[PDB]
Amino acid sequence: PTHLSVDTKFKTEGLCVDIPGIPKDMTYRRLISMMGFKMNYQVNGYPNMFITREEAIRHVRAWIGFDVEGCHGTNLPLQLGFSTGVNLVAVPTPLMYKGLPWNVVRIKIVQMLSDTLKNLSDRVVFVLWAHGFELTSMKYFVKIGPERTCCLCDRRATCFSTASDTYACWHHSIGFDYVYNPFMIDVQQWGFTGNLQSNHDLYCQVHGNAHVASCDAIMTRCLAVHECFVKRVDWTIEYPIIGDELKINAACRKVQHMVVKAALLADKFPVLHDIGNPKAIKCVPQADVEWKFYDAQPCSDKAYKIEELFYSYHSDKFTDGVCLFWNCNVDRYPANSIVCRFDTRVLSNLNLPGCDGGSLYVNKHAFHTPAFDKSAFVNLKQLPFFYYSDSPCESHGIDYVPLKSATCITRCNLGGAVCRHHANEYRLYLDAYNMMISAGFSLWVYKQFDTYNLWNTFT
Ligand SMILES: Cc1n/c(=N/[C@@H]2CCC[C@H]2CO)s[nH]1
Ligand SMILES: [Zn+2]
Ligand SMILES: [Zn+2]
Ligand SMILES: [Zn+2]
Numbered sequence: 001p002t003h004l005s006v007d008t009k010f011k012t013e014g015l016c017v018d019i020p021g022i023p024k025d026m027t028y029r030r031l032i033s034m035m036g037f038k039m040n041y042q043v044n045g046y047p048n049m050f051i052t053r054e055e056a057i058r059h060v061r062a063w064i065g066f067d068v069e070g071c072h073g074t075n076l077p078l079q080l081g082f083s084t085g086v087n088l089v090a091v092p093t094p095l096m097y098k099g100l101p102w103n104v105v106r107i108k109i110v111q112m113l114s115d116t117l118k119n120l121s122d123r124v125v126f127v128l129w130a131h132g133f134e135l136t137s138m139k140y141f142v143k144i145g146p147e148r149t150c151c152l153c154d155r156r157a158t159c160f161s162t163a164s165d166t167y168a169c170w171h172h173s174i175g176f177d178y179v180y181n182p183f184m185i186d187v188q189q190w191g192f193t194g195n196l197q198s199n200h201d202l203y204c205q206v207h208g209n210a211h212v213a214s215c216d217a218i219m220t221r222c223l224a225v226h227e228c229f230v231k232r233v234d235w236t237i238e239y240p241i242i243g244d245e246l247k248i249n250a251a252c253r254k255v256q257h258m259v260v261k262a263a264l265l266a267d268k269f270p271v272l273h274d275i276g277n278p279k280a281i282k283c284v285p286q287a288d289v290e291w292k293f294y295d296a297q298p299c300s301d302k303a304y305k306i307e308e309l310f311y312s313y314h315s316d317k318f319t320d321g322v323c324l325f326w327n328c329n330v331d332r333y334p335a336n337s338i339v340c341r342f343d344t345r346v347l348s349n350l351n352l353p354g355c356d357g358g359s360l361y362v363n364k365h366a367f368h369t370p371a372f373d374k375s376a377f378v379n380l381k382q383l384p385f386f387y388y389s390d391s392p393c394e395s396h397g398i399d400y401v402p403l404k405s406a407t408c409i410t411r412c413n414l415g416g417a418v419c420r421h422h423a424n425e426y427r428l429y430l431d432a433y434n435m436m437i438s439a440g441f442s443l444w445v446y447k448q449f450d451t452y453n454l455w456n457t458f459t
Contacts, residue, residue: 004028004052006039014188018070018132036139044146046181051125056185057228058237060366061352062121064113065221066184068133069213078137080105081213083127083221084116090140096212103177106141110159110176118170119349120242122156126184127221129196143178157181187224199223203230204356226355229368230300238364243349245363248439251432256283256326256340258429259443262388262409263322263338264289266453271321275309276328289321296328300358300368303329303376322446329370335379339444344372346440361440383443385433386451387426390458393419403427409454 006029012022023030028050032039037049056063065083070076077099080088088108089099097108113124128134148157148167155169159176168176192199197209200219203226209215261284264272271290274280278295292315296304309330310318323337333339344351344359352360357371388409403423405413412419418426 003055004048004050006032006048010186011189014130014186015132015135018136031135035135037142037144039144042146046144046147049144049182049184051183051185053185053190053228055183056125056127056224057234057366058239059121059123059125059183060225060228060360061239061242061362062117062123062125062183063127063221063224063352064116064124065217065219065224066126066128066134067213067216067220068137069216070133073133078133079213080109080137081215081217082112083214083217084112085214085218086112087212087214090137094210094212094214102140106179107175107177109141109179110173113179114159114170114173114176117158122169123158124179124182126182127217127224128184128186129188129216129220129223130186138184141179142182143180145181147181185224187220187227190227196220196223206355206357222353222355225352225360225368229360229366230355230358233297233300235365235367237366239362239366244435244439245350247432247435248350248363251435251439252340252441253283254429254432255436255443258388259383259445260284260324260338261287262386262451262454263445263449265388265457266449266451267322269321271315273315273318273321273323275323275325275330277326280326283326298327298367299329299370301370303331303370303373306330306332306334330376331373332376332378333380333444336446337380337444338383338446339377339380339442341372341376341442341444342369343440343442344369346438348438348440351440377444379447380444381447381449383445383449384451385430386454387429388451388454389422389425391422391425393421395419395421398424407451409451411458414455414458 007027010026010028010031012026016022028048032049067081069079071079074092077089077091080090085095087096088105090102090105091099093101117124143160150157150169150172151166152172153169157167157180158170159168159173160178160180161176196216196219200223204222207218207222264287269289273292275294276296282291323334325333325337325339327340350361350363354360354368358368361367361369386407386409393412400420403418403426408418408426410422412422
């Protein structure tokens with residue numbers, strides 16, 4: 001039970017308006033054959049074009065919703081829609097393109113998937129709400145065979161060229177015309193009552209239906225992401241490193257210790273209510289403060305209602321001391337809070353678009369995060385950048401230029417001039433901070449927070 005068997009049954013009901021008379025009894029084997037593909041009994045790493053739901057989830061970075069609308073059938077033109085927003089009209093002779101024959105349409109398909117996926121995945125997974133034309137049109141831009149490697153590198157082959165009879169990964173596909181060994185999954189195989197728009201609209205208001213194929217491709221993938229990452233949560237599934245994952249997470253841990261440590265020095269809160277991940281550790285283990293923990297798993301549907309986290313009768317007096325919501329998404333934060341809230345709008349290779357305004361943040365694990373809402377922070381202010389250090393001014397051990405900054409809160413800066421050690425740490429902390437901000441995180445703090453109260457901790 002690692003791969004999807006070709007002898008598995010395929011429910012064909014959703015395919016009988018474009019394919020009238022299609023048999024009720026159908027396996028993937030007969031379906032791939034009907035699509036115009038010969039599998040030849042190949043034990044070379046590609047057992048089925050279609051994949052399991054578990055395999056689709058392990059490869060979410062590769063998802064591209066795909067839908068074809070019969071615009072007028074190898075007589076009528078076909079509008080090919082993709083969840084990237086692209087609409088290509090192929091003739092059999094929001095980005096809507098005019099009718100062009102398959103030989104040029106296929107070149108555009110390879111460019112679009114290559115530029116979209118080269119930094120995300122080693123493959124493409126076509127997410128469908130299959131009715132007929134998308135499966136039958138796959139023979140016009142897809143070639144299948146044994147698993148292969150790139151002609152220019154050691155990555156897996158995702159594209160083929162008829163002009164040169166060579167294979168390439170997403171990075172080296174310039175000029176390639178065919179999609180090689182793609183994967184696909186039909187959402188309509190998961191047991192849905194009603195059409196695509198009806199099932200999608202139950203959970204999302206962001207994606208409308210402007211009746212173009214790309215609208216259905218977007219709603220398809222959005223619904224597939226809700227089923228796999230909103231209503232079903234699997235935090236065990238590990239995901240390959242494709243970017244700045246380790247630096248972003250190290251930066252987040254440094255910023256948390258910094259922001260919280262300074263807050264406890266500046267306003268000397270007797271108690272700290274730490275609301276969030278049930279596996280949390282005290283980020284400032286030397287602080288005098290009464291550290292109280294409360295468990296709240298990363299919500300993936302709607303942000304927590306502050307009235308349910310705190311009320312119905314815990315320390316109970318959350319109003320006493322300070323509240324820390326580190327990556328804990330609530331609808332309206334209290335005034336006495338330190339908050340790290342991820343911005344689902346951020347454009348990055350880690351953050352994939354999600355359902356109902358949310359985003360799927362993929363960094364080691366997959367976390368669907370609810371839509372950003374500036375109203376959550378009405379009782380708070382944006383946390384300003386600062387670097388605080390009580391460590392001794394001692395070098396031990398990178399050519400220097402004197403650091404001069406009003407945001408370097410150290411004994412040396414108070415006393416007149418920043419020492420080398422603290423200037424190395426400042427520039428390092430500023431990089432880790434900038435790294436965290438770029439990854440999409442936001443930092444918010446109680447309105448009375450003032451970095452001025454930190455200079456007095458050097459009496
Ligand atoms: C218009 C739009 N942009 C999107 N970008 C996705 C990011 C991962 C590849 C793309 C797969 O759809 S989704 N909707
Ligand atoms: Zn390559
Ligand atoms: Zn949606
Ligand atoms: Zn110093």
